Amino acid sequence: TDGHNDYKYIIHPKNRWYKAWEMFILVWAIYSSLFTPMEFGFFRGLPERLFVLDIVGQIAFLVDIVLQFFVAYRDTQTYRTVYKPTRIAFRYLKSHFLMDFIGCFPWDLIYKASGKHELVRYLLWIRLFRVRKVVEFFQRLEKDTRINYLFTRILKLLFVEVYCTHTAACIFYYLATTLPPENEGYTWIGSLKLGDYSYENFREIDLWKRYTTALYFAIVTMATVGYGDIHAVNLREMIFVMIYVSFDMVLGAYLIGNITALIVKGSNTERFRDKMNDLISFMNRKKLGRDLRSQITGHVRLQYDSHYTDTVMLQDIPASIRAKIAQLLYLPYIKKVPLFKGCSTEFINQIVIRLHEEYFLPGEVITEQGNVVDHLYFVCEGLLEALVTLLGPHTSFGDISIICNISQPFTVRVCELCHLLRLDKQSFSNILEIYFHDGRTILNN
Amino acid sequence: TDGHNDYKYIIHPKNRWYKAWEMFILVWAIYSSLFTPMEFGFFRGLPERLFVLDIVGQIAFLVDIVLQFFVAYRDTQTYRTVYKPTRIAFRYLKSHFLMDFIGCFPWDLIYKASGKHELVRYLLWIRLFRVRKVVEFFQRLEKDTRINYLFTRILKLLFVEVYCTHTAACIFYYLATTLPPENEGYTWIGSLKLGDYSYENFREIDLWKRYTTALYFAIVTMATVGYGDIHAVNLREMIFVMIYVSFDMVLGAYLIGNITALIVKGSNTERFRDKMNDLISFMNRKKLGRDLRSQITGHVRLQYDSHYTDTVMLQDIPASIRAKIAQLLYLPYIKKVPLFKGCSTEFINQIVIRLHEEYFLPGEVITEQGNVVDHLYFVCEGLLEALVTLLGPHTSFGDISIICNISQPFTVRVCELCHLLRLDKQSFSNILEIYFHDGRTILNN
Amino acid sequence: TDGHNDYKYIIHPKNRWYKAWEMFILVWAIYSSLFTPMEFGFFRGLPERLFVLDIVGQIAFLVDIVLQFFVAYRDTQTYRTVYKPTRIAFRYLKSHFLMDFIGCFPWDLIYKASGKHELVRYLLWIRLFRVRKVVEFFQRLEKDTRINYLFTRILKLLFVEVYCTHTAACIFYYLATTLPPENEGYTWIGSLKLGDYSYENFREIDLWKRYTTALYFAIVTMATVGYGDIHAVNLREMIFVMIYVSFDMVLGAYLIGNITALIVKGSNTERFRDKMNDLISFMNRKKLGRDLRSQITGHVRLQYDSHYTDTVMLQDIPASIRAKIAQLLYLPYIKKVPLFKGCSTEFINQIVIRLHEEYFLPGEVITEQGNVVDHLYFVCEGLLEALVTLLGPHTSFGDISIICNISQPFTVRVCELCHLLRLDKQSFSNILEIYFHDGRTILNN
Amino acid sequence: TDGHNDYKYIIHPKNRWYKAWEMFILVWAIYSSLFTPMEFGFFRGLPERLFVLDIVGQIAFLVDIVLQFFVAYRDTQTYRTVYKPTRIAFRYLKSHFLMDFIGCFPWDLIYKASGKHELVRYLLWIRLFRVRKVVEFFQRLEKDTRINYLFTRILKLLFVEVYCTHTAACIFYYLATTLPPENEGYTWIGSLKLGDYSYENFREIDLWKRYTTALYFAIVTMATVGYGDIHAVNLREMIFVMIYVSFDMVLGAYLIGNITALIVKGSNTERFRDKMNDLISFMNRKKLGRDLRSQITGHVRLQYDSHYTDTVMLQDIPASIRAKIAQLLYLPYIKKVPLFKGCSTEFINQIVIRLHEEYFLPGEVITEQGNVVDHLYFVCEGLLEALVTLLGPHTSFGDISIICNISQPFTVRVCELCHLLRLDKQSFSNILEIYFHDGRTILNN
Ligand SMILES: [K+]
Ligand SMILES: [K+]
Ligand SMILES: [K+]
Ligand SMILES: [K+]
């Protein structure tokens, strides 16, 4: 049914070893996309101590480049995995090969060996295409797990603001170095003074102090607090902050809208907790007794912990798996009454449709004597009494009266924890109207 | 049905005296969780005047520790209260015993008697586990009262912001004391100047001025106003404010989303106030008369003050309590017509299903002469006329015409306040089709 | 039906002259609730030029006090207007008499004539109970007009922010005057300097400059901009601004939530504009022709301008007014076919139920030849052709084929603007199954 | 059907050349509405180099004025295009002629030639009525394209904030020039100092520096950041900023509400992605097997990519176009079974109602042996097996058993990609109950 593995060169994408390589390269992509604006903004050429780290950081991405010619992929309009080499290679060469290949050049060595022209350093910015691995990690997370999709959209949106503030801090520091050191007093950092400390001659301050000051400015700006102890003084800095606040206005509105859309679509538990209020306000706008309505409030409080299970599989998709699990679950404790002592298997797998499951309290009254019967009760386990018999597990009652349209002679009550099954004789009568092999064996008592 | 109180050592959790102890310890937990950051941040060791208060404040929590081995608790998967001592003790020793016990040590005396090492004072922060009583108070409030659940979620969220601003103010003051007094001018408070007052030599300013300044900074920061007369100058202070504003951005978005989700799920009164607009715009997009549509607008305005009571108990839960209250309410003013002079009790408790309650105005017209009858009217009290008889309380009409399919001879009108009951003869005919002991006695006139 | 006007002292509340007095006193209540914080905050005793205005401003409220013993009011649980004098007077004396009476005392003369004690001036603040007229004006506006209720709730909430900023500005100015003039440099205004202008000796600056500065501070604070050129320097001013920003945080969240809840509950026009997109995307996800689907898109675009009128009066309230207007509208252009040449009036007022109104385009095809008929068309006006006759106004067709279950012989098309009525013969057949006096006269052709 | 083009002077509004003129004038309207506040605010009379541009800019609007007497327009209450000259001219002369005509006067030459009175320059502000073309462009965009209406409302609202900040910057600069140059130190720009640069003698600073400073202030104010390095010092400037922040508070609340209302009305894909979670949590709250429920989860994942197509054309509008495309699509691969070898065309175009389209996986089981048949399967293409025959394209099965109420003898399974059609024999039986010409030819095998 595969039609392939006649090649034995191609890697199945859901292999165990290949999924270990994919999480190795994601950490390198996270590190490489955080270091690149710091390399562009705070240096003009790397020092000697970062040479071997800069060389090692590209070998992993070159190995990842050569691996993509050996991976099978799943087609979109069809749903078969392609195992053919030329179809793999042409899809790679038309999608992602070019930027991945030219982001692996040694751009720090080319800058130092060609007379230190500043426009050569602008090609470092194409290494920010490596966040593709992070967006593919977030795309794979939201489909196949047990967490809802809106929470992952909030976490995905929260990851974007960290990256945007870090990049804005690096660019805001870089703009101050495009003036000569003799015009230092006309920049945002060369004229800064905080406490009794002066930021003059700022190119010789160590790296983490400058980075912390720039990140402090960017994070205070992004939250719209804006103290004003650090601000812009140039025209280029004014243009940069005018672009930056316009972007994060829309970003903050998107975050607020996503959190609101999460909260508005609340859960079903509070979709019946309000119904509690409507019912008891109806019961108390006029006057009424207190005892058996407190009984029915405890009843619905334990009943709504099971009644969400009804609507999800009433008839939403027409599966025969519900017939399989219905033969699996209910009637292996219902064959044991003499009611179904000799019914055909047609009626055993036909009965299962309207056995609704509800749980009850040790203080309710089960059935009435002066009654026309409505529901038939089918017990899982029980120690429940009646005042003439005490009904136990794997039993039933009520069918002594309903088909012959008689009142029940029993006053059935409870002292224990309940698991019984509903039955209306609407479905019993209409399919007993078709098949009566059972109906002979039901009235054979 | 209890199976216990054979021990007589165990306290029922819904006792009257025990609920007085629970509100005594909640005030101590509120006080103890507000004083602990002020003790950590503004002192290095307590003075002499707080000694007896510090000793007394732990005795109540030790007594509360020894009381938890004597309280019965309600099981989760079962719903019976456990009264056994070893099952109580093992649940306490696996849940909450450790942090409650080690938060009761005298950590101020241990700090002074071991050479004043600063790391010993960090163990004061485990006394913030005593806000468990406040979150359990807010969990008990939202289930069993007459207030809706979203308003309590807004009040619960508003309590968190007070506690967060108070703790942030204490930590922001504490960070300034981790420098020596000779580097005082490189702190946020040691370099502050407001008006013509200087904050130098700040360790000798009295306590409430320092606390008020720090709380003013924290509350102005939390609302995102940010005047900038107080700000950070260090690197540790910059890192602290970078963490703090990122937290309250998400907190403010959560508050806005909760208030919006409260407002969007509006009440039913304005769910028919718009329906007023749709109906009268339909009536006025074409031309129509004015008199009897003003009648029906006053009619629906007094009718929608009762028609919310229909849907809540049509058939939502299948209770026989509605049959009990239906025998209790309606027909003790409906037996008094000669219509039901001799009907069986089966028909008396069967009739009750489709008597819908509506109230009317002193100016409407009740019934028509040239008619096929649709509704049957069953009056609570009345002084209403017809032009040949004036119908009063405990009466009926319309049944002279409907079962024999005749037109009504009466022109029934009103001058008084109305309480009558609807009836369609759909239900009357289909259950009169089953039982006619009544039907003999109805036509016995 | 009134039972009263046997008194002739009492004023009906919906009189014409009394509604002129109610709008006279509303302007005085607006003026009196804006002037009172300016009188408290910017003066210590009024000057001579405001004496006659201060005296005149209380006479109107005294006259309004004596008028409330002569107004009839509508009861709540009943809905009759009460005309009895003692029932009027006791309701006034238990609701609103006390604060209205003691807000009319001459508190400026009492302050000057009792030694100028400052605590006497605090009784001016009970004149802010006169905003009751504004909240009653906003309560009367939202019930009985043609504007929706959420827009009036937004305008009501926008009125509150103006009043809150004006009162906060007056209190913020008042706090600076509670220090002596020798400690002037320790206040927010006594130490202010803007441009090359100094605010020293601030008690002799004229009134509108001081008021404009305080209102500028309050409005910049309320919008959370916070420039920081004006700020607090005292402890009492810090406590005041800490209270003030906490209030308007919740106020701004309430405003955002109300505007969002207005926008989310959009109109029905865009509730079918999306349905346009779903239908044409279904029609274009597979391939299809272009001509007659462009016809049906123009059809539904002119059809949804009338199909909102269906659901509002299908069966929502069971009125006979729809039978009255149904005899008024449709069939006075439908009696003119020989189809209903002699039907009984029972069938004339019975037919009206399923004549749905739709409008059409000059390019559609009306009917088919090779057909089993589904709908019957009942024209208002027309010049529509068929290829053998050209059907005009007050006519019909299709009934030549449907009751005898024949195909139609006509190919009916259009060139003009359409107003015809639907009819399914489901309703025609089931009520023709009951009454056939008509059925003789229908087949009398 | 037109009734016109007997004039040959009038231009049809959907001509090809006229739609080229409409986009030419939109660029001139955008330029003219951006230049006018810069001409009012930063100059007192234009210089010599802008003379020919100022003259040329009005000739296009004069030509556009004379063109509007020759355009046909579509009536509102009718839907016919009017081609009559006097009806065109009177609508123009009552709607838009006056402001368009008097905005074309040479107001720069009139100011210089009448003694330079400043009130003459205020008539430049009536050229801001030319944004009518931009609001008509945004009105035409949102009706007839493939983008949803709420996204265009967000983009329309984002365009307003750019125009409002640009106009506010020009007015804020203009207010500083209304004082003499000797009171320069009492303005916002004449007292400004940034870094080591001073803004004194500000009328001789070049234009783009002044404009960039004013726009930086306005954009920082609009986002509610508010650094405070530029602020107001006068009373007129205070009044202007008090008006401006009150406007953009409501504007920001409107933007947040629109984005939230976009996000809350999410798409249908995540309206079944939650249903995945509810179904598998129902299947895993009790214990169950893993194999065939993983089958049905892959089934519903490929099934919900087609089941949105059902509800949109079940019965929403009653079109015969669905009968036309139903004869076009399905049964030209269903005539090829001997099941419909000789049925009448009535049954061929009657069958089409309940053939629902679903797609399946290469691993499912199609049918059962021990069965009462529910659905009938009608294949597009297939290579599917049974264990006795391998069923291919243009075939069917299941009808060997269902009409005679027999069990199926086949165990039908799959290995390929599925396109089969559902059929319940409810519709087959009820319309086979009417027409049995087919029923003879179905049982003719
Ligand atoms: K802000
Ligand atoms: K600020
Ligand atoms: K701010
Ligand atoms: K500021």
mmCIF file with all atom_site columns, C-alpha atoms in Angstrom, chain D residues 100-160:
data_model
loop_
_atom_site.group_PDB
_atom_site.id
_atom_site.type_symbol
_atom_site.label_atom_id
_atom_site.label_alt_id
_atom_site.label_comp_id
_atom_site.label_asym_id
_atom_site.label_entity_id
_atom_site.label_seq_id
_atom_site.pdbx_PDB_ins_code
_atom_site.Cartn_x
_atom_site.Cartn_y
_atom_site.Cartn_z
_atom_site.occupancy
_atom_site.B_iso_or_equiv
_atom_site.pdbx_formal_charge
_atom_site.auth_seq_id
_atom_site.auth_comp_id
_atom_site.auth_asym_id
_atom_site.auth_atom_id
_atom_site.pdbx_PDB_model_num
ATOM 1  C CA . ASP D 1 100 ? -16.310 72.559 -5.061 1.00 0.00 ? 100 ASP D CA 1
ATOM 2  C CA . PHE D 1 101 ? -16.670 75.822 -6.970 1.00 0.00 ? 101 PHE D CA 1
ATOM 3  C CA . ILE D 1 102 ? -15.538 78.183 -4.221 1.00 0.00 ? 102 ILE D CA 1
ATOM 4  C CA . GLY D 1 103 ? -12.627 75.954 -3.287 1.00 0.00 ? 103 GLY D CA 1
ATOM 5  C CA . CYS D 1 104 ? -11.119 76.711 -6.709 1.00 0.00 ? 104 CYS D CA 1
ATOM 6  C CA . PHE D 1 105 ? -10.539 80.434 -6.175 1.00 0.00 ? 105 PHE D CA 1
ATOM 7  C CA . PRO D 1 106 ? -6.936  81.706 -6.112 1.00 0.00 ? 106 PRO D CA 1
ATOM 8  C CA . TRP D 1 107 ? -6.821  82.477 -2.396 1.00 0.00 ? 107 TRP D CA 1
ATOM 9  C CA . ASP D 1 108 ? -3.064  83.079 -2.304 1.00 0.00 ? 108 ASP D CA 1
ATOM 10 C CA . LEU D 1 109 ? -3.267  85.895 -4.855 1.00 0.00 ? 109 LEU D CA 1
ATOM 11 C CA . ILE D 1 110 ? -6.268  87.478 -3.128 1.00 0.00 ? 110 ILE D CA 1
ATOM 12 C CA . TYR D 1 111 ? -4.392  87.585 0.190  1.00 0.00 ? 111 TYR D CA 1
ATOM 13 C CA . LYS D 1 112 ? -1.341  89.315 -1.290 1.00 0.00 ? 112 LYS D CA 1
ATOM 14 C CA . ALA D 1 113 ? -3.350  91.833 -3.329 1.00 0.00 ? 113 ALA D CA 1
ATOM 15 C CA . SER D 1 114 ? -5.668  93.130 -0.592 1.00 0.00 ? 114 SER D CA 1
ATOM 16 C CA . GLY D 1 115 ? -3.236  94.395 2.033  1.00 0.00 ? 115 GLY D CA 1
ATOM 17 C CA . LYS D 1 116 ? -2.389  91.031 3.696  1.00 0.00 ? 116 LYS D CA 1
ATOM 18 C CA . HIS D 1 117 ? -5.319  90.723 6.078  1.00 0.00 ? 117 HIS D CA 1
ATOM 19 C CA . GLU D 1 118 ? -5.039  87.540 8.112  1.00 0.00 ? 118 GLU D CA 1
ATOM 20 C CA . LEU D 1 119 ? -8.746  86.632 8.009  1.00 0.00 ? 119 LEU D CA 1
ATOM 21 C CA . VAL D 1 120 ? -8.569  86.091 4.237  1.00 0.00 ? 120 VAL D CA 1
ATOM 22 C CA . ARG D 1 121 ? -6.219  83.140 4.789  1.00 0.00 ? 121 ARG D CA 1
ATOM 23 C CA . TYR D 1 122 ? -8.846  81.239 6.786  1.00 0.00 ? 122 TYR D CA 1
ATOM 24 C CA . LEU D 1 123 ? -10.722 80.425 3.571  1.00 0.00 ? 123 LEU D CA 1
ATOM 25 C CA . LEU D 1 124 ? -8.047  77.870 2.666  1.00 0.00 ? 124 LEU D CA 1
ATOM 26 C CA . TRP D 1 125 ? -9.724  75.394 5.035  1.00 0.00 ? 125 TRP D CA 1
ATOM 27 C CA . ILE D 1 126 ? -12.636 74.714 2.659  1.00 0.00 ? 126 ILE D CA 1
ATOM 28 C CA . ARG D 1 127 ? -10.282 72.742 0.421  1.00 0.00 ? 127 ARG D CA 1
ATOM 29 C CA . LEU D 1 128 ? -10.499 69.909 2.962  1.00 0.00 ? 128 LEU D CA 1
ATOM 30 C CA . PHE D 1 129 ? -13.839 68.938 1.426  1.00 0.00 ? 129 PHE D CA 1
ATOM 31 C CA . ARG D 1 130 ? -11.800 67.105 -1.241 1.00 0.00 ? 130 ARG D CA 1
ATOM 32 C CA . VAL D 1 131 ? -11.462 64.028 1.024  1.00 0.00 ? 131 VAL D CA 1
ATOM 33 C CA . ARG D 1 132 ? -14.913 63.133 -0.315 1.00 0.00 ? 132 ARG D CA 1
ATOM 34 C CA . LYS D 1 133 ? -13.091 61.279 -3.098 1.00 0.00 ? 133 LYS D CA 1
ATOM 35 C CA . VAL D 1 134 ? -11.224 59.180 -0.542 1.00 0.00 ? 134 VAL D CA 1
ATOM 36 C CA . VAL D 1 135 ? -14.370 58.255 1.378  1.00 0.00 ? 135 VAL D CA 1
ATOM 37 C CA . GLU D 1 136 ? -16.093 57.381 -1.893 1.00 0.00 ? 136 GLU D CA 1
ATOM 38 C CA . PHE D 1 137 ? -13.107 55.225 -2.842 1.00 0.00 ? 137 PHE D CA 1
ATOM 39 C CA . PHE D 1 138 ? -13.413 53.423 0.484  1.00 0.00 ? 138 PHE D CA 1
ATOM 40 C CA . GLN D 1 139 ? -17.192 53.073 -0.001 1.00 0.00 ? 139 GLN D CA 1
ATOM 41 C CA . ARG D 1 140 ? -16.726 51.510 -3.433 1.00 0.00 ? 140 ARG D CA 1
ATOM 42 C CA . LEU D 1 141 ? -14.029 49.140 -2.174 1.00 0.00 ? 141 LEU D CA 1
ATOM 43 C CA . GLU D 1 142 ? -16.017 47.414 0.568  1.00 0.00 ? 142 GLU D CA 1
ATOM 44 C CA . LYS D 1 143 ? -18.980 46.282 -1.530 1.00 0.00 ? 143 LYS D CA 1
ATOM 45 C CA . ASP D 1 144 ? -17.653 44.572 -4.689 1.00 0.00 ? 144 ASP D CA 1
ATOM 46 C CA . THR D 1 145 ? -14.443 42.616 -3.929 1.00 0.00 ? 145 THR D CA 1
ATOM 47 C CA . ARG D 1 146 ? -13.288 39.400 -2.201 1.00 0.00 ? 146 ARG D CA 1
ATOM 48 C CA . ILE D 1 147 ? -12.194 40.898 1.148  1.00 0.00 ? 147 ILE D CA 1
ATOM 49 C CA . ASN D 1 148 ? -14.384 40.942 4.248  1.00 0.00 ? 148 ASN D CA 1
ATOM 50 C CA . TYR D 1 149 ? -16.015 44.139 5.445  1.00 0.00 ? 149 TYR D CA 1
ATOM 51 C CA . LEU D 1 150 ? -14.505 44.386 8.925  1.00 0.00 ? 150 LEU D CA 1
ATOM 52 C CA . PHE D 1 151 ? -10.901 44.406 7.694  1.00 0.00 ? 151 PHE D CA 1
ATOM 53 C CA . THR D 1 152 ? -11.720 47.329 5.401  1.00 0.00 ? 152 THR D CA 1
ATOM 54 C CA . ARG D 1 153 ? -13.325 49.121 8.344  1.00 0.00 ? 153 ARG D CA 1
ATOM 55 C CA . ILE D 1 154 ? -10.085 48.692 10.294 1.00 0.00 ? 154 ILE D CA 1
ATOM 56 C CA . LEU D 1 155 ? -8.015  50.029 7.378  1.00 0.00 ? 155 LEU D CA 1
ATOM 57 C CA . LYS D 1 156 ? -10.463 52.917 6.935  1.00 0.00 ? 156 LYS D CA 1
ATOM 58 C CA . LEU D 1 157 ? -10.074 53.770 10.613 1.00 0.00 ? 157 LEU D CA 1
ATOM 59 C CA . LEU D 1 158 ? -6.278  53.535 10.413 1.00 0.00 ? 158 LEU D CA 1
ATOM 60 C CA . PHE D 1 159 ? -6.233  56.095 7.592  1.00 0.00 ? 159 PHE D CA 1
ATOM 61 C CA . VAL D 1 160 ? -8.026  58.643 9.806  1.00 0.00 ? 160 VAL D CA 1
#
